[PDB]
RNA sequence: ACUGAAACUGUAGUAGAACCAAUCGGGGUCGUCAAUA
């Protein structure tokens, strides 16, 4: 991301990371996952500059859990 | 961890060249008409 910073009067630093749509799935090797903490991360986001909407994350979404190979899309004055 | 700013899709270019709305024609002149009984 190669933005400006209008109050700075100068370019913003280049922000590198992962684009939206990127997906990953893990086995949990140990420890319970707190549904309340997953909810909080799904609210606040992860990483840097989440205040302006970076870092927004979906946990355990059914679309990443589905098998879809057989499915189809739905059909003056 | 904070919207960039500012910038006329404008500039030049003749919908035109060529083509006859024309060719021929004396404002002239003579025999009947009609069908029954």
User: Which DSSP helix (H) or strand (E) runs through A63?
Assistant: helix A62-65
Q: Beta carbon of A7 within 7 Å of strand B?
A: yes
Give the closest nucleotide to A12 (alpha carbon vs C1').
Answer: B4
| Method underlying the structure | cryo-EM
Nucleotides of B under 7 A from a protein CB: 1-4
Task: Give the three-class secondary structure for A11.
Answer: strand
Picking from A23, A4, A15, the residue whose alpha carbon sits closest to that of residue A50 is: A15
d(CA A13, CA A44): 22
Q: Could you tell me the resolution of this structure in angstroms? A: 2.5
Residues 13-52 of A with CB under 7 A from strand B: 48-49, 51-52
């Amino acid at each position: 991301t190669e933005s400006w910073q209008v109050r700075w009067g100068l370019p913003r630093p280049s922000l590198v990371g992962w684009q939206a749509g990127s997906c990953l799935i893990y086995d949990i090797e140990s420890g319970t996952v707190n549904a309340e903490k997953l909810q909080e991360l799904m609210i606040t986001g992860i990483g840097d500059r989440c205040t302006e909407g970076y870092g927004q994350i979906g946990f355990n979404d059914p679309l990443l859990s589905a098998s879809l190979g057989k499915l189809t899309a739905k059909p003056s004055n």
